[PDB]
Amino acid sequence: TEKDITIKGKTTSQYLASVVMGNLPPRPFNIRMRRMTPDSTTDQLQNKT
């Protein structure tokens, strides 16, 4: 894991946030992301990333 992210706000607008990292490893590589909050089950929750 290179970096974590947590958001604890309340909004209904599409909010975009930028996070930077320093690329120490050389050579072309791959980058991935994983969501820890489980997917929505009902329509009452819509936290989509």
Partner 1 sequence: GMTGILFSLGASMVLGGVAQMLAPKARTPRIQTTDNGKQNTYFSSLDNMVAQGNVLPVLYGEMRVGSRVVSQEISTADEGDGGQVVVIG
Nearer to partner 1, 8 or 32 (CB): 8
Q: Does 35 bind partner 1 (CB under 8 A)?
A: no
The binder of partner 1 chosen from 12, 17, 31, 36 (CB under 8 A):
17
Q: Does 13 bind partner 1 (CB under 8 A)?
A: no
Q: How far is CA 38 from CA 5, 14, 17, 41, 45, in A?
A: 15, 19, 21, 9, 11
> Which residues here bind partner 1, judged by CB under 8 A?
3-9, 17-20
